[PDB]
Amino acid sequence: AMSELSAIETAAAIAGGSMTALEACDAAIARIEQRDGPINAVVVRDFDRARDAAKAADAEIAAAVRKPLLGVPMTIKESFDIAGLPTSWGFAEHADHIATADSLVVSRLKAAGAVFLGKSNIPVGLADWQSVNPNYGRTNNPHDHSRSAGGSSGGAAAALAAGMVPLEYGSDIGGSIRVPAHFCGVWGLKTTFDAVSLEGHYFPRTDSAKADLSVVGPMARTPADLALALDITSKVPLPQSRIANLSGLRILLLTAHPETVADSATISAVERAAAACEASGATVATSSPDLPDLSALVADYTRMLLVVLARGLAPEGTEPVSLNAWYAMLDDQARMMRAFDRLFESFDAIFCPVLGTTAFAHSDEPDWAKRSLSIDGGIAPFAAQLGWISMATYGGMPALSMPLGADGNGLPINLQIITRNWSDHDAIRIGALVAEALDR
Amino acid sequence: SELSAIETAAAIAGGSMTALEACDAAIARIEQRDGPINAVVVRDFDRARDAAKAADAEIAAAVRKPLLGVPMTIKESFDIAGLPTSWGFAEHADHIATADSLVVSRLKAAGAVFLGKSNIPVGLADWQSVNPNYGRTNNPHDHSRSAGGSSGGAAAALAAGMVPLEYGSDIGGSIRVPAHFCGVWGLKTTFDAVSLEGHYFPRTDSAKADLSVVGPMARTPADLALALDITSKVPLPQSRIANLSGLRILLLTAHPETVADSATISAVERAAAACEASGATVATSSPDLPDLSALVADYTRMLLVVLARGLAPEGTEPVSLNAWYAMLDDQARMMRAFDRLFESFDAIFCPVLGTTAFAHSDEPDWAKRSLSIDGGIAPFAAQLGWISMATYGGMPALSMPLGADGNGLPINLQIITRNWSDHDAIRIGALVAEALDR
DSSP, rough: OOOOOHHHHHHHHHHHHOOOOOOOOOOHHHHHHHHSSOOOOOEOHHHHHHHHHHHHHHHHHTTOOOOOOTTTTTEEESSOTTTBBBBBBOOOOGTBBBBBOOEEEEEEETTTTTTEEEOOOOOGGSHHHHSEETTTEEEETTTTEEEEEOSSSHHHHHHHTTTTEEEEEEEEEESSSEEEEHHHTTEEEEOOTSSSOOOOOOOOTTTOOOOOOOOEEEESHHHHHHHHHHHHBBBBBOOOOOOOSSOOOOEEEOOOOTTOOOOOHHHHHHHHHHHHTTTTTTTTEETTOOOOOHHHHHHHHHHHHHHHEEETOOOOTTTBEEEEEEEEHHHHHHHHHHHHHHHHHTTTTEEEEESSSSSSSSOOOOOOGOHHHEEEEEEESSGGHHHHHHHHHHHHOEEEEEEEETTTSSEEEEEEEEEOOOOOHHHHHHHHHHHHTTTT | OOOOOOHHHHHHHHHOOOHHHHHHHHHHHHHHHSTTTTOOEOHHHHHHHHHHHHEEEETTTTOTTTTTTTTEETTSSSOOOSOOOOOGGGGTTTOOSSSSOOOHHHHHHTTEEEEEEEOOOOGOSSSSSSSSTTTTOTTTTEEEEOOSSSSSHHHHHHTTTSSSSEEEEESSSSSHHHHHHHHEEEEEEESSOOOOOOOTTTTTTOOOSOOEEEEEEEESSSHHHHHHHHSSOOOOOOOOOOOOOOHHHHOOOOOOOOOHHHHHHHHHHHHHHEEETTTEEEEEEHHHHHHHHHHHHHHHHHHHHHHHHTOOOOTTTOOOOHHHHHHHHHHHHHHHHHHHHTTOOOOEEEEEESSSOOOOOOOGEEEEEEGEEETEEEGGGGGGGHHHHHHOOOEEEEEEEEEOTTTHHHHHHEOOOTTHHHHHHHHHHHHHHHTTTO
């Protein structure tokens, strides 16, 4: 009913003359000041300098200059660097750390003409499926202010779902792009590993970006905005999709995991997307002899994630992992990556839940081991849900989180579409085709 | 002169010759010329003739592939199902691979026929090609000098005209140095742009995840570009450079930690001068050129760790995983320093190595080795600085024929371009050849 312009639609209106870049900037500033009160998503604001960049974009528009995102207002996850703006990752010690240079993703998007109004909220250390920190506060889900907006790119997904900005960009090392888009019912693409540069996504007061597991990708409300943002930010132009329809598509449907569980409403929602593809000409399978050991994957992924997040350091007394043992873990990862290369020889995509349930209620327990989730009235471990996102992060494959529907309480349910490595554009295309199939 | 890889595929698809005829003609050139050279040390001629007969059947079905029926060889470190992969070790001579490597799969899918594999040093750890399993490869321009390493057999087979295409690996110049010694074309690719799946250490599934790259080797720049398009993880950005006019070239004939021949210095200077006459701008210094003396030191400390798999001699303390993560951040800092350098320059022109092909050496320790630079003795291991920038920075580096020294040994030029501009390095190289032939 209530609808906002997409990133491509905004650029088309500015290039045509329906509106100016300053009008689009001021319209988004209005939506932020009007709607971010109960949501607390756009926690870093640079509206004055954003209006100056929109006035410069209209000068280029008047100089007949045309760029794919010229004048389009947007925000980015607070973990990305913007010159003049702070980068804190939620740490109070790092709230006065002001970046001196823009991040690569910001440079790429600015070079396409985008205007950055500010940065979206995050949890402390980007280490939660929530968005809460002592510098900015807590971000609330626009669909139910009592539930989490997700994390670590929760402020990004909440700003999108509330219609404040049409485009965003987040990071993902343990679902931190797919889970926020799942909780807020927006579009988020976990990209292929090493496909987009993490330069500028630095830990505060360093130049260190994660060299393992972590990926940065676009977040939006339309698959076309995701595809344009991917082409603007990738290290090289990635292969465009040649999938024209769902006929002939090979889909592996997974509604269960050896180490975690999913809602009945979640299972029926993912099963409904697969059925919409079968009626559109696709073939869907529920088992494969080439599906890797997901129980070993999640175990090997968790052991690597904790080492990457700890920078190889160990608790006092505990012996650290050796460099030789780390090299052995990378060979274990590459062994799993090829196991998925063989799986993706018989299947075009994996359809599975993003997470086992919808957005959970706000939690003040920092320890994931002291948390639990309600799966159809039952008590389930919280951290075990990392298995739903382990395949794409540990295998490196692109994974799309796209809106599928909502549960009985109105909380969005998203679908995870996993395709083979470097087929990010196929994950976007299959997702757009799933949306068409579900709207018929 | 021999046919190139593209010319061979064009003659097979046109009907000038068949794929079995091209296979048998390359088998003939190998058996006729590899006697004093010893480059094609693993031979699969029987199964190669069966694959050429299958290519001719596809050719007769109007099927057309870019390398359909083209006979070639690959460096012995690459896996081919049914063929051994030993890396020169006697302990690994009976290690037969069960599946083809990724590069071999890509090239076979483009229609290439693999006649065999080219010689290597033990452990791929020398600028020579000699091992107890196959013997020594000799430079086709002077059988007393090294053919290069670690992909020396590949460059020697190309220089002798046996096969039109080859593929090697490079962690310390092992693609550029062999092509430099034999006067052929070799592309050190951008890091992580081509998969090393199948380039496994014998009897493992472990491929180097740092510094090392695999790239094409040929005698024409156009053959390099086709093989790159066939083997890269994704189609890489094609070059839009049409001529040398307007090109920004940083000419480097000196290094803070090593030296170059006077004939080498004049050869690289002659390539740079040919570009100025074609409209290019050439500079001899840049305030944005990183500290090459620190680069080689940080690269050498990382190279030794990668080659040792993090292990340390007894008594010596190993490098910690935390310290390793810091070394990767030190590497990325240097990579961004080159991103700024390549904002003012399109390419770096510098020597591949400080001198031409050296005489066969039996000293395993590089610290006990030396090189003859214009009558003087210069350290051997210090020459790693000529190849350190591209490997440690990740940039693509092309080794292309420039000429020969006074003794007839080839001198090649190293063309370094920015990361992911592999096709620009090939294009600038092809344009350097045109300018020097005028």
